[PDB]
Design a protein around this ligand. Sequence first.
Ligand SMILES: NC(=O)c1ccc[n+]([C@@H]2O[C@H](COP(=O)([O-])OP(=O)(O)OC[C@H]3O[C@@H](n4cnc5c(N)ncnc54)[C@H](O)[C@@H]3O)[C@@H](O)[C@H]2O)c1
Ligand SMILES: NC(=O)c1ccc[n+]([C@@H]2O[C@H](COP(=O)([O-])OP(=O)(O)OC[C@H]3O[C@@H](n4cnc5c(N)ncnc54)[C@H](O)[C@@H]3O)[C@@H](O)[C@H]2O)c1
Ligand SMILES: CCCCCCCCCCCCCCC
Ligand SMILES: CCCCCCCCCCCCCCC
Lengths: 346, 346
Amino acid sequence: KDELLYLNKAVVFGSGAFGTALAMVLSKKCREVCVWHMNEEEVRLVNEKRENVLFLKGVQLASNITFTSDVEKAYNGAEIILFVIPTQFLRGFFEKSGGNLIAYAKEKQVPVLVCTKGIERSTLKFPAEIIGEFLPSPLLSVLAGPSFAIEVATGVFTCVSIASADINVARRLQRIMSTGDRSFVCWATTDTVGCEVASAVKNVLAIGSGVANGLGMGLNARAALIMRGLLEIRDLTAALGGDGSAVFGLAGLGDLQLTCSSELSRNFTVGKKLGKGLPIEEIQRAVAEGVATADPLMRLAKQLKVKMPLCHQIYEIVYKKKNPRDALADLLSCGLQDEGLPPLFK
Amino acid sequence: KDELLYLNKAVVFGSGAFGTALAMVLSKKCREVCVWHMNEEEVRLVNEKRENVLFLKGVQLASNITFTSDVEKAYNGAEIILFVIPTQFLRGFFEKSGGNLIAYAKEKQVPVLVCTKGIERSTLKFPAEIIGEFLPSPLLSVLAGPSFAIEVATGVFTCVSIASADINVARRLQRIMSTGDRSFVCWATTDTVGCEVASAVKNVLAIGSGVANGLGMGLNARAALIMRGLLEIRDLTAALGGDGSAVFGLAGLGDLQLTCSSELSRNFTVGKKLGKGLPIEEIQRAVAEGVATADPLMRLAKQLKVKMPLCHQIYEIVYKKKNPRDALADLLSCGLQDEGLPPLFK
Ligand SMILES: NC(=O)c1ccc[n+]([C@@H]2O[C@H](COP(=O)([O-])OP(=O)(O)OC[C@H]3O[C@@H](n4cnc5c(N)ncnc54)[C@H](O)[C@@H]3O)[C@@H](O)[C@H]2O)c1
Ligand SMILES: NC(=O)c1ccc[n+]([C@@H]2O[C@H](COP(=O)([O-])OP(=O)(O)OC[C@H]3O[C@@H](n4cnc5c(N)ncnc54)[C@H](O)[C@@H]3O)[C@@H](O)[C@H]2O)c1
Ligand SMILES: CCCCCCCCCCCCCCC
Ligand SMILES: CCCCCCCCCCCCCCC
């Protein structure tokens, strides 16, 4: 259906930039919107300042958005639940505080939208998979696409995709997340796996995009990294069982191109410094998603016997003090090859 | 084979930036390299200045590169012929001066590489197809990929693809164009049609990327245009008989992302001005490829009953004084849809 759906309440667990940006999106489709944060003193500050000075400074929060550190109040009445908690804290949240919320979720059959992105070190599992350990798959959906928080929060034209096993589940969410002014447009897909893989790998590849820059290469080089790196996301997706229909969609191609062209992103800057020779230790100072993700990505790929050329070299440069230039050469040592893309039309 | 091939002579018909940039690439794989230009007085100047002050200022030409306005001398002895003449002058060249050259080409079975990009107004045909009217298909190959002339001419890491019906023909050329320092890497593909379609459509879409900017949208918007516009190149390719294996390769995704992220390109700037409301007439002042290409692209699409949403609106804004904002709204009037991408894995 091409007609939207408005709700009375919507809860968003994750008080960071993206979660807040999404609260902003929701403020225009939901009568009430609570954003769960943990530090109570902070929850107050924000509500006072009418601004998430913590993770989204400069953005005036809508009035119908309320921050609360009380999970119970937070989810109570919500007709849609969003999870934008960093991957590393996700599991802990459910073990320590998801008790009742999970009950409520199952009870009222509330639709859950996974917005977190990454890989859990301990299990090498993705967000929606982790949450899936507590909440049934049928209720789970994934939101992925080129969506810089700031642009989304301030209402600047953005397109993302909603992935769910049941396309109809994705479409319902599609009608809930899409805004009245068409400033936030959603596209439905079933490729949950592809979306999750892409959301994670993109950060690693972003670092390579930065490496390429600090290494003196230009835009041609970047377009090639983006195009070649996309096959790596494709192959890892295939290995994990995903149908891959999202790989060349907004979740993959889209977000990938965005994330890799973001010259100010921590991923890019970190990679740039590496490209210029600065050791990872020296850099540090606030870790880049790509850096955190690189190790487990490598372990998952290895475990699945999936070859990710670019991602691997990026892992070496980061975790094994490999010279960016040597990495680049090793990468190109493969010799002349075919593009390696199947035809789409017979 | 992963081992290169060096030649004695190579001719490049097309004295513009890209042709010169490619002469530079060839200067490192060919003993001798002539670049055919038409104005004799100019051919001298350049040879004197050791620089193509006409279309590639600031770039010092290698010594083994010689400009000549004598087609006969130019092609004589060449072991590879490149065509980088603008689409509109292509046919005229062969009718007026290709006489002997064609003979020589067929005679010695010299490999031809089509580097020109666009659509001929009169026939709505692409470069390699036009040249194909004079030289047999078997000898023809297409070079396409994200390759800004300057970066290519100055040796900055670049990746492009070589497309030929016979993959082996593409691979031979692959070993001739790939450089010893791995600064120019070629990938083989068969999707000649896809490559040509992509090379042309990209310019139109670039204007939209500019429109989006002048219209106040941000990077999220651009990533979406790139991802959505790519399906248009896909569909037109399917309609023209291409196998489409290049659509998501360097020729398509690659070049597309590059061309659309080039904020200084004439396509972008023209589109930006349109996005800001300036009428096309006013703008002008040196035409943007995207503008020229928009009309025939539209006529070809219509003739083939292929729907290209973004390209169509871009055509309206340019040729029919349509308000960019109205165009954007008409575009989004489609309602909520699925991403519309087939799965890659069953
Ligand atoms: N930032 C973006 O533009 C964007 C776009 C898409 C997806 N994402 C995804 O969003 C998530 C994070 O992005 P962000 O900018 O919203 O977040 P952020 O880094 O601004 O989030 C900080 C959040 O982490 C919590 N936190 C910090 N330390 C904690 C601890 N020890 N225990 C429990 N909670 C703790 C805070 O209370 C807060 O909710 C990731 O999954 C990322 O991939 C971000
Ligand atoms: N510029 C790039 O970075 C790039 C990258 C890929 C493909 N291309 C393709 O290259 C071609 C043009 O790009 P460029 O920068 O090399 O060229 P350019 O615009 O710099 O080329 C000018 C050329 O056109 C010729 N010319 C001009 N007017 C003429 C007339 N009336 N009759 C006959 N010849 C005339 C000149 O003598 C010269 O060879 C297109 O096919 C384009 O799609 C360019
Ligand atoms: C991390 C450094 C910069 C990388 C710039 C891009 C390289 C692109 C091509 C990779 C080809 C891989 C071929 C198979 C092993
Ligand atoms: C030319 C103006 C700016 C366009 C910015 C991008 C719009 C992207 C989405 C297009 C969707 C088309 C849907 C089907 C008709």
